[PDB]
Amino acid sequence: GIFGAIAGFIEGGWTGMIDGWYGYHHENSQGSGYAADRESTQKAIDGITNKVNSIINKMNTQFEAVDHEFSNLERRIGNLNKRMEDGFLDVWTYNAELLVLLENERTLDLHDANVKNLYEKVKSQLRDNANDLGNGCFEFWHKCDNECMESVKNGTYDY
């Protein structure tokens, strides 16, 4: 990633986290678990749903070729029709393939950025109440129950 997060300092992903795109793995000795940050994930979901929907509807026109036939003395206009139809076919092909390539990239960079921002949103609610291993994992000096674990992710952590 260009934001360095996905396949970066957080070099892997969690098979365990199944109901979101971004999230957490706390472990206290009430226990363990995966839980996803549902409001950044829902923001990414909405943004990307909008992107796809935008692309689909900007692509809701069709150039229409025709069955029209041409005599032996209509070679020129026959060829004109062929070059026209092929012409538009080529530009729409180009437009579609190019767009996909570009947007795919940007979609990945978007996700990469989002992960990075979440990591950043936690590091400065928690900064010496915590240490940082640098792999994107967080180190508390205190005692962290799960209304403490819920402290952090709720965004109400009390410093």
């Binding site: 990633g1 997060a5 396949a7 957080i10 892997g12 992903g13 098979t15 986290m17 199944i18 795109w21 971004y22 999230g23 957490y24 793995h25 706390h26 472990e27 206290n28 996803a36 749903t49 796809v52 692309i55 689909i56 692509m59 809701n60 069709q62 150039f63 229409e64 070729a65 025709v66 069955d67 036939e69 041409f70 005599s71 209509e74 139809e85 076919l89 729409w92 092909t93 579609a96 393939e97 996909v100 390539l101 570009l102 795919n104 990239e105 979609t107 990945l108 996700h111 992960v115 936690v122 792999n135 994107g136 994992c137 967080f138 180190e139 508390f140 005692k143 962290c144 674990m149 952090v152």
Partner: protein, 325 residues
């Protein structure tokens, strides 16, 4: 005790490509292109297409004797002409403005055949001997088009000026046909139409037509050295057609009341079967059933289809890069 931040992964092996890197697996993605086809012809807006079988459009609309299966009224959402239609123009000659005619009929939706000029219209001529072995039915080896009549002078006297009128008092335009016979020599001309310079002349409010025979020695085609110049036109509502000729007329007999469609219209030359299906999108290559945006099946279609494109896939990444361990 302590907490970490990360992202999703799964068993998905579906990959996408970007400008910087190809073949990148992602958690969720969507396919925008359909490449799947039902190789068949089905109905459009619940209305069946018209199969011309072993007849071409010319043979159908001129009423080639071997095309009586298509004779009479017809309604269609589109037309299917078969690549190997044998029965078209049986009597050798050229259908003038053929391609414009096809384009016009394609713009059509229904035709009602009717008698426009009974043979009684043409006075002092023989209307019963206009047959040739070039146009057999499946009942006589020598016949002629069902929509045309080949007039010959009486077996006695010469060829009088003959006249015909049709006042289109109806609400529908009328598609009709006629022709000029072109003998190979002067003596055939005289056996069939008698001496003197001959003409075929036709006039409406918005169209006038006049042609003479162009008699020349030709090679045999279907055993015929003569030719016929076939013509078509459209008598619009309100208009009236006057016909005048003193020889060589291939007179209009039956014609078609025509219902043009505002629409699309299609004529598919294809071998695919017509089945009892329905469809919202029908291409020359088959039927599409999809919610997708793009397709690479065919640029020629009727109904509402995805944008045709030459790509084999257009898969859009929605999820994240997949990094499971």
């Amino acid at each position: 005790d302590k907490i970490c931040i990360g992202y999703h992964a799964n068993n998905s092996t579906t990959q996408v490509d970007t400008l910087l890197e190809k073949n990148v697996t992602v958690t969720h993605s969507v396919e925008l292109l359909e490449n799947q086809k039902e190789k068949r012809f089905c109905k459009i807006m619940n209305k069946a297409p018209l199969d011309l079988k072993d007849c071409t459009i010319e043979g159908w609309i001129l009423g080639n004797p071997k095309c009586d299966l298509l004779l009479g009224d017809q309604s269609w959402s589109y037309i299917v002409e078969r690549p190997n239609a044998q029965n078209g123009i049986c009597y050798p000659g050229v259908l003038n403005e053929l391609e414009e005619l096809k384009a016009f009929i394609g713009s059509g939706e229904r035709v009602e055949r009717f008698e426009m000029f009974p043979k009684s219209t043409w006075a002092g001529v023989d209307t019963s001997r206009g047959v040739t072995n070039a146009c057999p039915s499946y009942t006589l080896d020598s016949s002629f088009y069902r929509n045309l009549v080949w007039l010959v002078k009486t077996d006695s006297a010469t060829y009088p000026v003959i006249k015909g009128t049709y006042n289109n008092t109806g609400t529908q335009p009328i598609l009709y046909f006629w022709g000029v016979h072109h003998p190979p020599d002067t003596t055939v001309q005289d056996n069939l139409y008698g001496s003197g310079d001959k003409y075929v002349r036709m006039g409406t409010e918005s169209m006038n037509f006049a042609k003479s025979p162009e008699i020349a020695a030709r090679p045999a085609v279907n055993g015929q050295r003569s030719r016929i110049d076939y013509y078509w036109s459209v008598l619009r509502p309100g208009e009236t057609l006057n016909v005048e000729s003193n020889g060589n007329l291939i007179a209009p007999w039956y014609a078609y009341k025509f219902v043009s469609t505002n629409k699309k219209g299609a004529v598919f030359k294809s071998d695919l079967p017509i089945e009892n299906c329905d469809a919202t999108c029908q291409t020359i290559a088959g039927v599409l059933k999809t919610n997708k945006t793009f397709q690479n099946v065919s640029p020629l279609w009727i109904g509402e289809c995805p944008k045709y494109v030459k790509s084999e896939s257009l898969r859009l990444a929605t999820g994240l890069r997949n990094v499971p361990q």
